[PDB]
Design a protein around this ligand. Structure first.
Ligand code: ECP
Ligand code: ECP
Lengths: 260, 263
């Protein structure tokens, strides 16, 4: 599959989601192509064991649809694209992997049914449902926020959705994240790359704003930038000290620079 | 409960086998240790029938106090350069690997470590203590190494290890059979561990070796450093409270974490 075929396949499915915008499909495919391209070499290697082809169109489009779903949900929250009633119904459906009870959101059932069918290790599917609920809640709790930088960063780590991205990749290509999750070190890296992602976004409510409202005289911009530097170094140190199975090393690095 | 001065003397007797050990190390260890044991005493009484570990066992108590004195002494070895870099490295090897120290003047290390191994209710806790000892050691040196200054993030991550709460909890679990090795399998438990440790680190830096306050002030002179940290400390406390509520950890973990927050 090239690019517009993927974009159109994501867009076609998006028509079954009220509030879906073209950009949700376009940016999901662009970000998704970026990640898959950076981990391709590592993937084809594991392809021997799993039997999951890096170029499998079905797997690629499903991965892109999950990314589009994440972008769409974020806008639904930040921009009120759909009603609060609709959002609650959609989040309930996506979090349990069942059809939405309200009309105009058939895409939820389609995507989740697909993920269940394609899950290499079904434990990743349950984990994805879990990450979806966490994500939904972090978007809501953050929108409704008095917040300390610590609490902000803790919630932001879940609202950035990197955990969901990793879990979807594991689900489709059999990357055994369900097993790697048991290692405290892996969990640590997950938190760091996510915080990196959250800071990069807030810098590019939001961190900068939150700290400015509270500390008018604080160089919040440089501070937050040092924080980003700080987290990146800690990520590297742990990446070395620990040795994660392909394609996790290139994947984590890919996520760190997705600011391209 | 062994009398205070009798415990101090027992800690001091062992401490005499560590170059640079000072009376203060034993005295402060017994004071902090008694504070902790008194606050979790009712709980330990409750688990004693199951474990066979008596809250008033002098051997267990003195051993816990000696580990606390060890941590105080190590902090000073770094902070005041009581021993040479070569001697500190050898001490870290013995305490972090559980082997005899290759250099003379530190017999107390292998002695305390051997007692802990022998006394461990669940031997996993001993290996955990060795791990926590390595983290604590590395953190003391990293902090002291702190030129290119650390980010607040890097500081707190390191201060979480340098505060030694993990070590204290692990030693308690080893001695009184508190099943920390199993509880550590729960993500929520590991989170409260990082939380209570960050809390202890912030409180220490504010109340009264790189310091959070002097750190943020040298890099961000204009920012209201102290105000910020006090806000971050309240933030960690709120997070801790909610997790402790959501999750209902077996006794004595609730009282133990509560006691550390107030110490
Ligand atoms: C919109 C996005 C497209 C997909 C893309 C991938 C490929 C997953 C790589 C990471 C970035 C991204 C998810 C990208 C951005 C997603 C999104 C709009 C983030 C907005 O912030 P978020 O963490 O959702 O919380 P908040 O609502 O912004 O507070
Ligand atoms: C490890 C120590 C022994 C036990 C003691 C109790 C009894 C729990 C009371 C709280 C302190 C402590 C945990 C104590 C801590 C030793 C130590 C000096 C903690 C401060 O961190 P440290 O590594 O010294 O870095 P810094 O010098 O504060 O920058």
């Amino acid at each position: 599959i090239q690019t517009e075929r993927a974009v159109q396949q994501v867009l076609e499915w998006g028509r079954s989601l009220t509030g879906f915008a073209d950009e949700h499909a376009v940016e999901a495919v662009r970000g998704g192509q970026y990640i898959l391209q950076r981990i391709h070499p590592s993937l084809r290697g594991t392809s021997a064991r799993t039997g999951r082809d890096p170029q499998d169109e079905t797997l690629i489009v499903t991965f892109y649809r999950e990314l589009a779903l994440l972008f769409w949900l974020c806008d639904c929250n930040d921009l009120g694209l759909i009603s609060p009633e609709q959002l609650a119904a959609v989040e309930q459906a996506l979090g349990q992997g069942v059809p939405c009870a309200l009309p105009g959101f058939e895409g939820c059932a389609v995507l989740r049914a697909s993920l269940a069918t394609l899950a290499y290790d079904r434990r990743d599917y349950a984990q994805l449902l879990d990450d979806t609920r966490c994500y939904s809640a972090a978007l809501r709790a953050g929108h409704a926020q008095r917040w300390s930088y610590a609490e902000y960063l803790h919630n932001g780590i879940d609202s950035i959705a990197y955990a969901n991205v990793f879990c979807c990749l594991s689900l489709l290509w059999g990357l055994d994240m369900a097993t790697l999750r048991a290692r405290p070190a892996f969990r640590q890296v997950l938190r760091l790359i996510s915080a990196i992602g959250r800071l990069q976004n807030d810098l590019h409510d939001n961190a900068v704003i939150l700290l400015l409202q509270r500390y008018p005289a604080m160089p919040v911009v440089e501070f937050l930038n040092d924080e980003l530097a700080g987290h990146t170094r800690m990520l590297h140190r742990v990446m070395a000290e620990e040795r994660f199975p392909a394609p996790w090393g290139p994947l984590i690095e890919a996520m760190a620079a997705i600011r391209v």
